[PDB]
Motif scaffolding. Structure first.
Motif, PDB file in Angstrom:
ATOM      1  N   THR A  27       0.832  -1.191   0.000  1.00  0.00           N
ATOM      2  CA  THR A  27       0.000   0.000   0.000  1.00  0.00           C
ATOM      3  C   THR A  27       0.874   1.250   0.000  1.00  0.00           C
ATOM      4  O   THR A  27       1.986   1.231   0.531  1.00  0.00           O
ATOM      5  CB  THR A  27      -0.935   0.032   1.218  1.00  0.00           C
ATOM      6  OG1 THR A  27      -0.276   0.667   2.319  1.00  0.00           O
ATOM      7  CG2 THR A  27      -1.351  -1.375   1.619  1.00  0.00           C
ATOM      8  N   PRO A  28       0.406   2.343  -0.595  1.00  0.00           N
ATOM      9  CA  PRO A  28       1.237   3.545  -0.699  1.00  0.00           C
ATOM     10  C   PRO A  28       1.201   4.390   0.568  1.00  0.00           C
ATOM     11  O   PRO A  28       0.349   4.235   1.441  1.00  0.00           O
ATOM     12  CB  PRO A  28       0.615   4.294  -1.878  1.00  0.00           C
ATOM     13  CG  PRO A  28      -0.808   3.880  -1.864  1.00  0.00           C
ATOM     14  CD  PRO A  28      -0.827   2.457  -1.395  1.00  0.00           C
ATOM     15  N   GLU A  29       2.168   5.304   0.648  1.00  0.00           N
ATOM     16  CA  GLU A  29       2.194   6.297   1.712  1.00  0.00           C
ATOM     17  C   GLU A  29       1.040   7.278   1.535  1.00  0.00           C
ATOM     18  O   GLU A  29       0.883   7.876   0.466  1.00  0.00           O
ATOM     19  CB  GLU A  29       3.528   7.036   1.703  1.00  0.00           C
ATOM     20  CG  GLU A  29       3.634   8.135   2.730  1.00  0.00           C
ATOM     21  CD  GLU A  29       3.743   7.599   4.140  1.00  0.00           C
ATOM     22  OE1 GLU A  29       4.327   6.511   4.321  1.00  0.00           O
ATOM     23  OE2 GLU A  29       3.241   8.263   5.070  1.00  0.00           O
ATOM     24  N   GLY A  56      -9.987   2.091 -18.285  1.00  0.00           N
ATOM     25  CA  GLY A  56      -8.886   1.573 -17.508  1.00  0.00           C
ATOM     26  C   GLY A  56      -9.134   1.645 -16.015  1.00  0.00           C
ATOM     27  O   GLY A  56     -10.129   2.185 -15.533  1.00  0.00           O
ATOM     28  N   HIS A  57      -8.196   1.076 -15.273  1.00  0.00           N
ATOM     29  CA  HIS A  57      -8.322   1.024 -13.827  1.00  0.00           C
ATOM     30  C   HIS A  57      -8.171   2.410 -13.214  1.00  0.00           C
ATOM     31  O   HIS A  57      -7.380   3.234 -13.682  1.00  0.00           O
ATOM     32  CB  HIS A  57      -7.276   0.079 -13.244  1.00  0.00           C
ATOM     33  CG  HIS A  57      -7.707  -0.590 -11.981  1.00  0.00           C
ATOM     34  ND1 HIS A  57      -7.708   0.053 -10.763  1.00  0.00           N
ATOM     35  CD2 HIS A  57      -8.161  -1.841 -11.746  1.00  0.00           C
ATOM     36  CE1 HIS A  57      -8.138  -0.776  -9.832  1.00  0.00           C
ATOM     37  NE2 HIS A  57      -8.419  -1.933 -10.401  1.00  0.00           N
ATOM     38  N   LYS A  58      -8.942   2.660 -12.162  1.00  0.00           N
ATOM     39  CA  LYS A  58      -8.760   3.853 -11.350  1.00  0.00           C
ATOM     40  C   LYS A  58      -7.345   3.890 -10.785  1.00  0.00           C
ATOM     41  O   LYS A  58      -6.786   2.860 -10.403  1.00  0.00           O
ATOM     42  CB  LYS A  58      -9.786   3.864 -10.220  1.00  0.00           C
ATOM     43  CG  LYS A  58      -9.969   5.187  -9.528  1.00  0.00           C
ATOM     44  CD  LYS A  58     -11.098   5.098  -8.521  1.00  0.00           C
ATOM     45  CE  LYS A  58     -11.306   6.419  -7.809  1.00  0.00           C
ATOM     46  NZ  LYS A  58     -12.292   6.299  -6.708  1.00  0.00           N
ATOM     47  N   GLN A  59      -6.754   5.081 -10.753  1.00  0.00           N
ATOM     48  CA  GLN A  59      -5.365   5.250 -10.354  1.00  0.00           C
ATOM     49  C   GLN A  59      -5.226   6.417  -9.392  1.00  0.00           C
ATOM     50  O   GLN A  59      -5.995   7.377  -9.437  1.00  0.00           O
ATOM     51  CB  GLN A  59      -4.461   5.489 -11.561  1.00  0.00           C
ATOM     52  CG  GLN A  59      -4.242   4.277 -12.429  1.00  0.00           C
ATOM     53  CD  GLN A  59      -3.532   4.618 -13.711  1.00  0.00           C
ATOM     54  OE1 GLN A  59      -3.553   5.760 -14.154  1.00  0.00           O
ATOM     55  NE2 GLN A  59      -2.891   3.631 -14.314  1.00  0.00           N
ATOM     56  N   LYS A  60      -4.227   6.329  -8.526  1.00  0.00           N
ATOM     57  CA  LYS A  60      -3.846   7.423  -7.649  1.00  0.00           C
ATOM     58  C   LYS A  60      -2.466   7.925  -8.045  1.00  0.00           C
ATOM     59  O   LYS A  60      -1.628   7.165  -8.531  1.00  0.00           O
ATOM     60  CB  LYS A  60      -3.844   6.990  -6.181  1.00  0.00           C
ATOM     61  CG  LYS A  60      -5.178   7.159  -5.495  1.00  0.00           C
ATOM     62  CD  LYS A  60      -5.022   7.243  -3.998  1.00  0.00           C
ATOM     63  CE  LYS A  60      -4.715   5.890  -3.406  1.00  0.00           C
ATOM     64  NZ  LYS A  60      -5.959   5.164  -3.050  1.00  0.00           N
ATOM     65  N   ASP A  83       4.218   1.652  -8.806  1.00  0.00           N
ATOM     66  CA  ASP A  83       3.654   2.929  -9.233  1.00  0.00           C
ATOM     67  C   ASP A  83       2.816   2.700 -10.483  1.00  0.00           C
ATOM     68  O   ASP A  83       3.369   2.321 -11.533  1.00  0.00           O
ATOM     69  CB  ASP A  83       4.750   3.964  -9.495  1.00  0.00           C
ATOM     70  CG  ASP A  83       4.230   5.389  -9.459  1.00  0.00           C
ATOM     71  OD1 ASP A  83       3.005   5.583  -9.541  1.00  0.00           O
ATOM     72  OD2 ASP A  83       5.045   6.322  -9.341  1.00  0.00           O
ATOM     73  N   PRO A  84       1.501   2.917 -10.433  1.00  0.00           N
ATOM     74  CA  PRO A  84       0.683   2.761 -11.642  1.00  0.00           C
ATOM     75  C   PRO A  84       0.914   3.844 -12.679  1.00  0.00           C
ATOM     76  O   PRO A  84       0.475   3.682 -13.824  1.00  0.00           O
ATOM     77  CB  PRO A  84      -0.747   2.814 -11.100  1.00  0.00           C
ATOM     78  CG  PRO A  84      -0.639   3.651  -9.883  1.00  0.00           C
ATOM     79  CD  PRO A  84       0.688   3.315  -9.271  1.00  0.00           C
ATOM     80  N   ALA A  91      10.756   4.421  -4.706  1.00  0.00           N
ATOM     81  CA  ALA A  91      11.381   4.133  -3.427  1.00  0.00           C
ATOM     82  C   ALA A  91      10.998   5.217  -2.435  1.00  0.00           C
ATOM     83  O   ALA A  91      11.103   6.412  -2.739  1.00  0.00           O
ATOM     84  CB  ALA A  91      12.902   4.042  -3.562  1.00  0.00           C
ATOM     85  N   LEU A  92      10.556   4.792  -1.255  1.00  0.00           N
ATOM     86  CA  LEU A  92      10.149   5.702  -0.196  1.00  0.00           C
ATOM     87  C   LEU A  92      11.363   6.047   0.658  1.00  0.00           C
ATOM     88  O   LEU A  92      12.024   5.153   1.195  1.00  0.00           O
ATOM     89  CB  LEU A  92       9.045   5.079   0.656  1.00  0.00           C
ATOM     90  CG  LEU A  92       8.597   5.853   1.899  1.00  0.00           C
ATOM     91  CD1 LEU A  92       8.040   7.213   1.526  1.00  0.00           C
ATOM     92  CD2 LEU A  92       7.568   5.061   2.679  1.00  0.00           C
ATOM     93  N   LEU A  93      11.660   7.336   0.769  1.00  0.00           N
ATOM     94  CA  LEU A  93      12.771   7.837   1.563  1.00  0.00           C
ATOM     95  C   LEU A  93      12.237   8.538   2.800  1.00  0.00           C
ATOM     96  O   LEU A  93      11.309   9.350   2.706  1.00  0.00           O
ATOM     97  CB  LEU A  93      13.635   8.816   0.768  1.00  0.00           C
ATOM     98  CG  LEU A  93      14.105   8.453  -0.635  1.00  0.00           C
ATOM     99  CD1 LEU A  93      15.106   9.491  -1.095  1.00  0.00           C
ATOM    100  CD2 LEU A  93      14.716   7.065  -0.666  1.00  0.00           C
ATOM    101  N   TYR A  94      12.828   8.221   3.948  1.00  0.00           N
ATOM    102  CA  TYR A  94      12.641   8.973   5.179  1.00  0.00           C
ATOM    103  C   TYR A  94      13.887   9.810   5.426  1.00  0.00           C
ATOM    104  O   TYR A  94      14.997   9.275   5.464  1.00  0.00           O
ATOM    105  CB  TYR A  94      12.404   8.045   6.371  1.00  0.00           C
ATOM    106  CG  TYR A  94      10.987   7.557   6.536  1.00  0.00           C
ATOM    107  CD1 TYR A  94      10.155   7.382   5.440  1.00  0.00           C
ATOM    108  CD2 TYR A  94      10.482   7.258   7.792  1.00  0.00           C
ATOM    109  CE1 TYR A  94       8.864   6.931   5.591  1.00  0.00           C
ATOM    110  CE2 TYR A  94       9.190   6.805   7.952  1.00  0.00           C
ATOM    111  CZ  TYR A  94       8.385   6.644   6.849  1.00  0.00           C
ATOM    112  OH  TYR A  94       7.095   6.193   7.000  1.00  0.00           O
ATOM    113  N   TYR A  95      13.703  11.113   5.590  1.00  0.00           N
ATOM    114  CA  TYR A  95      14.813  11.991   5.919  1.00  0.00           C
ATOM    115  C   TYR A  95      14.977  12.083   7.431  1.00  0.00           C
ATOM    116  O   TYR A  95      14.089  11.713   8.201  1.00  0.00           O
ATOM    117  CB  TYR A  95      14.596  13.382   5.323  1.00  0.00           C
ATOM    118  CG  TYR A  95      14.911  13.462   3.851  1.00  0.00           C
ATOM    119  CD1 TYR A  95      13.958  13.130   2.900  1.00  0.00           C
ATOM    120  CD2 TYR A  95      16.160  13.865   3.411  1.00  0.00           C
ATOM    121  CE1 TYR A  95      14.241  13.196   1.557  1.00  0.00           C
ATOM    122  CE2 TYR A  95      16.453  13.935   2.073  1.00  0.00           C
ATOM    123  CZ  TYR A  95      15.489  13.599   1.147  1.00  0.00           C
ATOM    124  OH  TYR A  95      15.780  13.668  -0.193  1.00  0.00           O
TER     125      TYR A  95
END
Ligand code: K
Ligand code: K
Ligand code: K
Ligand code: K
Ligand code: K
Ligand code: K
Ligand code: K
Ligand code: K
Ligand code: K
Ligand code: K
Ligand code: MG
Ligand code: MG
Ligand code: MG
Ligand code: MG
Ligand code: MG
Ligand code: MG
Ligand code: MG
Ligand code: MG
Ligand code: MG
Ligand code: MG
Ligand code: MG
Ligand code: MG
Ligand code: MG
Ligand code: MG
Ligand code: NA
Ligand code: NA
Lengths: 272, 89
Positions: A27-29, A56-60, A83-84, A91-95
């Motif tokens: 699942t996304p952030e 097409g499919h619903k996308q975020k 990523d659709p 890639a999810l980065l935490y600072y």
RNA sequence: AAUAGGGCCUUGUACACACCGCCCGUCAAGCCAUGGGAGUCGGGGGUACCUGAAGGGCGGGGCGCACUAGGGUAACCGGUGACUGGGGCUAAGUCGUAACAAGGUAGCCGUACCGGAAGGUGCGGCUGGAAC
RNA sequence: CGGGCUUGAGUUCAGUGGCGGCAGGCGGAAUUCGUGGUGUAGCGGUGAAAUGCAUAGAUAUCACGAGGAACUCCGAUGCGAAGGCAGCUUGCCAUACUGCGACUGACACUGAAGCACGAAGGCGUGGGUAUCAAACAGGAUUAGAUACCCUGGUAGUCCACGCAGUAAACGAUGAUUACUAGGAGUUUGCUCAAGCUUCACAGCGAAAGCGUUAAGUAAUCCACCUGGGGAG
RNA sequence: ACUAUAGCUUUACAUUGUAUUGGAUACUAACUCGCGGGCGAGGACACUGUAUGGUGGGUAGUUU
RNA sequence: AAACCAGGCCCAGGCGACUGUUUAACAAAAACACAAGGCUAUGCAAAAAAGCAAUUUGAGGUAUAUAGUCUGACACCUGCCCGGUGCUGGUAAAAGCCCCAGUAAACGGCGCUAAGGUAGCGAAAUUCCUUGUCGGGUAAGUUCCGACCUGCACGAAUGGUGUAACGAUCUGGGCACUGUCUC
RNA sequence: UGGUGACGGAGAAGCGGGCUCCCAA
RNA sequence: ACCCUUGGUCAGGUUGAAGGUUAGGUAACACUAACUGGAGGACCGAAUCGGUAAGCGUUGAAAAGCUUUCGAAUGAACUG
């Protein structure tokens, strides 16, 4: 990596999809996604200007950081994510300051790595440096065109460019299309090639998958009437003459780059 | 393999009477098993080291011959050594 | 008056009435044996099913077992068939000259592509080759 | 069947190796293309020519930029089960030879089936693509030239993964063990022992010839042959 | 087929200026673009107007 | 199987891989689409499409992407020609044009030219003559299947030749069954 | 200033819903 | 007709992909066996969408229908 489907169905006999082996989260952030509204290829007058788009499919939408402004603040890789909206993974980065961000995931990037941006950053994978600090001959992606505007050049899955020589305030870069061109030394780029290089090996297998991806069927010009298409008409099958579009634009050799563009002074060799 | 003198001496001390038992069964077996394991781990990364693969097959044959000699001698030592090291698969 | 081919050695040979030698392959001719094919006609046995004599069995009848007979699918063994392709031998009529001498582009093995035909060429290998 | 022995076999230790395998980096010469200086009547090729490139600017020559392939001299010898292996360096492996006063005690040889590896050419997917070059195109020679000679030229030749399993894959000579004469060289370990190639006793052979690396004398197991075509 | 024409394209003038050995180079100040809320990259080019030469079944009116 | 309910089956061809779509109201198909393949354009204010423009779509995507065009799963393959037509190059106060070079999975051609049709098919959804001829099936076959090749007038991405599966497709033959028919 | 709101599809399981799996996210 | 946003619907039966577990087999993979699992523009078939063939109707019940038959029916589905 890819997976081939066994031929239990005629619509599955020729299907090849990805294995999703590098994805670590499902699942996304939430703070970085927003709902996306689809165009059917229609502009603000409501008239369709681009064909074969719809459904097409619903996308975020995932907000991707193409600027890498937080220079000197290290970040840690949290997850690799689907990523659709684009071919490559993100890639999810935490600072260290509590900010969260998404970047395009390069090949060979794993969870737990540390990335940096700026002139001080080491020329390792996932770091974003000005081109004047990148040693000659390395593999780069996400190349800026103007300082501070954001990455525009090398972004699709698997693609990469090479920095081959530097000449004063410019550097010479060989592009994925084979073009050789000069880019200012102040522009930024990220070291490494884009991941998910097996994207080109996938085969849809059936028309329904294109419908899921949001494309509508394409009609050839030769099977229309002359009132709809210059190539149309005739009784029985006919070749249509010289191939051209609805407005008569030749489709087998006519160049369409403007032959007075100022960017030609920054191109060394051409291949497009 | 690492195949250090310390590793060989420790293997001989663990398997067989005293450290000096370098050339007896149940110790040649242990040395061959150690080398086979390390060669498998090396061939997992080097898939084209056909000479190393052939040497591994020769080591397997040598261990099989030593086990057959143990068969001809008795069965208790056979059972003990295979239970210890882990052989049948 | 004017003007300055033959023997003796070393080699290779598939020739020996002996290079005016011997041989290779294609096409056209005639005999013989054996291949492939829309289909068509038989023979022996087999699994199932439906009927099922005599003679016995069990219960004057009833129900069993199998000798056959019947349908059908499957094998194996065999014939024939519009048409279509190898091989052997005899003739040798035609077309070239591939090999045997460094056989006139050394030869041969594998492999791939291409040619009326023997063959040609590319890549690697061998000497069962000269010549240096 | 029950024990022993160390000479065969194997393990350990020390010394000496090596174009042995796999993987990562680094290189100069030559050569290809693109962009610019100089400069102009040809260049190239052949037995002789021509097809081709070249004054809307060649060959040659000086630079800058982008690449691919192969490793001169050493270099004939060494290694590997075979096929094969050659620029420099590093890492990880394997292996060989010699000896010990270390160990175990016949643990050995061969091997139908099976399995693994296996030149070149070929096939599939993705990269790359400088040279050479099947097929193809043109020019020559010939009676003809579907060839030899010349000019172009695509697969292929290169890399990764996977198929395929063939060769004059040859020493046309299977593996192991023991024994039997001399000469000429060569490499390593030190006069001695391993290896590497040509003349050559006994012996063998039809002969050419082999001859301590046998094709000699013997023993064990495996593979194969039984006239030529048809016919692998 | 005849005649036009949207679009595309060439040059001249205007926008449009300054220096050096003219037609090249260079400059920045017109003009254009990006970043942040001046800085960077270009630059007398590009863009647009007037005129002009090409192209123009994409479109139109017609003839046959 | 008790009523009602509730697959006919087999052999052999053409076409199209397949599920889908289409002429509301005479055509559901062999036509369209399709997954997939090739070529060409496009270095990002991208090319391209709407709009007088502003602006928007493309796309907030970046050459493993987007757009134009033809072919149309897959297997074996895809021959020769750049002569012609397209395309890419080197007057007002220079473009063009010429010439030369390249391009055929560009349009197109494959009878003295530019080159003279390669493999594979062939009386075919293509053959006029024509019910071509030989064989098979029937008591009798202008249709069907298999061969033959004087192919009027096949032919390799307006793809050639095959192909398991699929079809309210077209086409030939059997078994079952019957008022379709004798009537 | 940070969380909830807030989200797909298919399928177990509870006369005499969590959950599992999947990709088109 | 196509597109955009936001909702809803699809009786019942069948088949049995990926994957998982436990056995053997490997130096390790590989590779066989059983059970499990429940994928699919999968199969049969109601609602529903569509409209193959025949019959009827043709001043029709209807300016395009009815009856029987037939296609699809978890998807490129239907629908507010
Ligand atoms: K189409
Ligand atoms: K038109
Ligand atoms: K000859
Ligand atoms: K010759
Ligand atoms: K050899
Ligand atoms: K001799
Ligand atoms: K027909
Ligand atoms: K077709
Ligand atoms: K063609
Ligand atoms: K309804
Ligand atoms: Mg039409
Ligand atoms: Mg026609
Ligand atoms: Mg003749
Ligand atoms: Mg008109
Ligand atoms: Mg009028
Ligand atoms: Mg169809
Ligand atoms: Mg259908
Ligand atoms: Mg209609
Ligand atoms: Mg209809
Ligand atoms: Mg088509
Ligand atoms: Mg009939
Ligand atoms: Mg279905
Ligand atoms: Mg219904
Ligand atoms: Mg149904
Ligand atoms: Na025509
Ligand atoms: Na019937």
């Amino acid at each position: 990596g890819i997976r081939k489907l066994k031929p239990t169905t005629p619509g599955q006999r020729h299907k090849v999809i990805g294995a999703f082996d590098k994805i670590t989260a499902s699942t996304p952030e939430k703070s970085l996604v927003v709902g996306k509204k689809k165009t059917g290829g229609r502009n603000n007058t409501g008239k369709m200007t681009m064909r074969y788009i719809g459904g097409g499919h619903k996308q975020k939408y995932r907000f991707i950081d193409f600027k890498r402004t937080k220079d000197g603040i290290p970040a840690t890789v949290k997850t690799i994510e689907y990523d659709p909206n684009r071919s490559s993974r993100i890639a999810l980065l935490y600072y260290a300051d509590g900010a969260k961000a998404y970047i395009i995931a390069p090949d060979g990037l794993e969870v737990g790595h540390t990335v940096m941006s700026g002139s001080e950053a080491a020329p390792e994978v996932g770091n974003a440096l000005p081109l004047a600090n990148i040693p000659v001959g390395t593999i780069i992606h996400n190349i800026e065109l103007r300082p501070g505007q954001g990455a525009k050049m090398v972004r699709s899955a698997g693609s990469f460019a090479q920095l081959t020589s530097r000449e004063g305030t410019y550097v010479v870069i060989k592009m994925p299309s084979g073009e050789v061109r000069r880019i200012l030394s102040t522009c930024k780029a990220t070291i490494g090639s884009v991941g998910n290089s097996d994207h080109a090996l996938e085969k849809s297998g059936k028309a329904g998958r294109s419908r899921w991806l949001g494309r509508r069927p394409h009609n050839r010009g030769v099977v229309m009437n002359p009132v709809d298409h210059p190539m149309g008409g005739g009784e029985g099958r006919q070749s249509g003459g010289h191939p051209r579009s609805r407005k008569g634009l030749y489709a087998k050799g006519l160049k369409t780059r403007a032959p007075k563009k100022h960017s030609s002074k920054y191109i060394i060799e051409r291949r497009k | 393999m690492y195949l250090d003198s310390a590793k060989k001496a420790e293997l001989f001390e663990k398997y067989g009477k005293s450290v000096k038992d370098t050339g007896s069964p149940e110790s040649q077996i242990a040395l061959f098993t150690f080398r086979i394991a390390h060669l498998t781990e090396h061939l997992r990364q080097n898939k084209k080291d056909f000479a190393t693969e052939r040497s591994l097959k020769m080591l397997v044959g040598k261990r099989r011959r030593m086990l057959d000699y143990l068969i001809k001698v008795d069965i208790e030592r056979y059972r003990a050594i295979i239970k210890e090291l882990g052989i049948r698969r």
